[PDB]
Ligand binder design. Structure first.
Ligand SMILES: *Cc1c(COP(=O)(O)O)cnc(C)c1O
Ligand SMILES: *Cc1c(COP(=O)(O)O)cnc(C)c1O
Ligand SMILES: NCCCC[C@@H](N)C(=O)O
Ligand SMILES: NCCCC[C@@H](N)C(=O)O
Lengths: 357, 357
């Protein structure tokens, strides 16, 4: 069969979750939306179940997936419900539910509920994605309280630029949040991975680490705490064909790359349909049999090419690391204006082989 | 549940397959590797089964998927086998098999085979991906013939730049192929979608249309025949939140976009984990309730934002077309240096709803 695969190190996952808790002194929801950012939500939840305060996902189906698999820890629906008809199963499966807008509030007020809802009331404190404006937040809170449909309320917001350590936007958003929620009782939840790792003045009773769990830094440069993260996914394959070429020969579609000299090229069983980025430029780092090398030629749907010229011992069957502990996925992604989040989420087709369960 | 979904129009698929056959007068393998470029290999094969000469996939597992579903038409493994241990099931499932390199040839020569193999001998005629060099092709052919392990041989190659209609690389590759295969008996197979649509002087007994099946042109400009293709996938969702903003307010992560004026923004239940590109720039075309609109703000993993200011009738629950028959997926992709192939292949999480079966 094809030698492509994605290794998922669950010990590394636990390590990274623990770092988040230790750094903050807060309860932490492991953010495992989008199939744990491509790593496998059920398997990652199972691995964290014994020690996690809870999980967070994008929608009720991701939530139900976890419940069907036997996850009993709290689960937060980060966007709430999309249809009011979801409410009976939200209550029955005991999902914690974000409320970010007026129509959701109204649906709760007129809904017939078997048990009260645990609501995470979301404020738009400056990212202008979802949530109530600061000036509308108090009234929303009082309406949840008055409804008799709501048990606890957690007050929440989310940062747009916490990955920019020299940008004060995070400070501004916190100030707006604190001013608009002042005097309201309940826990608060503000911090994502960059704020957990890099913004120690930001408060939170509940933190919400996503990308750090997977061992990719959200930051563009080294950081003493993010430096301690352990990459979870290794995307790897093998060389399936070798070719000797004279200089000036085009490699792959579009001839973006031509051989610079007489070279030996290896074809690898990996391509953009698997999630490896088509945008990866010539000179992109790869590891070949445990040594640094480069990608040359445009990535195809199923296949990619690497330079074997300075790797005389390498050839057919050599192992190639596309990303992992030697080839950081975030540095790769930022090369062409992406973030590690996207590449990890794009993982498809290849087997996922879990270790450390 | 979340309103995101991908519509797959199987009538459009059949239409596009038929165009390829009609334009060429050749037998056509429907290329449905990578889960039919994200559209669903089994469902697309089932839809084409009654009229298709055959299918082509990337590997034995994609082949087996089709056989398990009851597909009885020929199936070509475009990269052959990755391990010689695949040969017994290749023979038993009657897979046509590419042979592109010496180690595969050698494995066939020493393999014990229950039935002979139908081999597509692949030449590297200038793309320098897989296949035998022209000067090695004849000897490879004679070795297959002499082995007594091989029934038919189809002589094949593949073009690197046929999507560039003003580039003579396609002509050069054909010349090299014809010169090196001259006098050898058997059918030939050279044409992919751009060569089917745009290079009528190129011969082929078997054509291999992939991207045109899905109703996306491989070309950067209009073309009379590619213009007749019908988009197969519609990626759509709905507006899940609306927000009025003053001018100069940042929208989404990174604040790449700030409101230009007083605006109304809508949050859509679609993001890059679903396959919608994170690279999509502000001003990207979308269709909102059947009318042109634009994307503003950076796309998030699960959510994206659109400008509703000039859409006074639109709001909560409005339908948004991300790509499809009004919003061409190829034009979107080429905006930021991608191709339609990648975006379609990246489809994840959302339901696929087939019509026309
Ligand atoms: C995705 C998400 C997170 C996790 O974000 P990271 O930046 O990956 O840590 C936390 N909170 C919310 C509201 C999210 O949507
Ligand atoms: C993917 C593939 C095709 C189909 O290509 P399109 O450009 O999508 O038409 C045809 N032949 C080979 C060898 C392929 O790998
Ligand atoms: N068919 C065009 C799409 C990209 C590459 C593809 N030829 C592959 O088999 O990898
Ligand atoms: N969590 C960061 C990844 C991108 C966006 C994500 N916040 C969403 O819920 O869409």
């Amino acid at each position: 069969m094809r030698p492509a695969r994605a290794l998922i190190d669950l010990q590394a996952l636990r390590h990274n979750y623990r770092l988040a808790r230790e750094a903050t002194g807060a309860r932490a929801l492991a953010v495992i939306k989008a199939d744990a950012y491509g790593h496998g939500a059920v398997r990652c939840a199972e691995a964290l179940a014994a020690e996690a305060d809870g999980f967070a996902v994008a929608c009720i189906e991701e939530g139900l997936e976890l419940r069907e698999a036997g996850i009993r820890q709290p689960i937060l629906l980060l966007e709430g419900f999309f249809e009011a008809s979801e409410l009976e199963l939200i209550v029955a499966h005991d999902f914690w539910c974000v409320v970010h807008c007026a129509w959701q509030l109204e649906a709760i007020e007129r809904a017939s509920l078997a048990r009260p809802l645990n609501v995470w009331l979301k404020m738009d404190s400056g990212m202008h994605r979802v949530g109530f404006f600061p000036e509308d937040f108090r009234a929303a809170h009082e309406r949840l309280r008055a409804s008799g449909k709501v048990a606890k309320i957690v007050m929440m917001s989310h940062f747009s630029r916490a990955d920019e350590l020299d940008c004060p936007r995070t400070e501004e958003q916190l100030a707006a949040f604190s001013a608009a929620s002042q005097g309201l009782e309940g826990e608060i939840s503000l911090r994502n991975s960059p704020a957990v790792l890099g913004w120690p003045k930001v408060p939170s009773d509940w933190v919400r680490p996503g990308i750090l769990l997977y061992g990719a830094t959200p930051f563009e440069r080294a950081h003493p705490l993010a430096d301690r993260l352990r990459p979870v996914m290794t995307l790897e394959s093998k060389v399936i064909s070798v070719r000797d070429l004279p200089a000036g020969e085009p490699v792959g579609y579009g001839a973006r790359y031509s051989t610079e000299r007489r070279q030996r090229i290896g074809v690898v069983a990996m391509g953009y349909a698997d999630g490896y980025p088509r945008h990866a430029a010539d000179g992109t780092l790869v590891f070949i049999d445990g040594k640094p090398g480069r990608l040359v030629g445009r990535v195809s749907m199923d296949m990619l090419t690497v330079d074997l010229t300075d790797h005389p011992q390498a050839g057919l069957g050599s192992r190639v690391e596309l990303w992992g502990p030697n080839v950081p996925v975030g540095a790769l992604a930022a090369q062409f204006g992406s973030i590690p989040y996207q590449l990890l989420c794009n993982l498809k087709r290849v087997p996922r082989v879990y270790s450390g369960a």
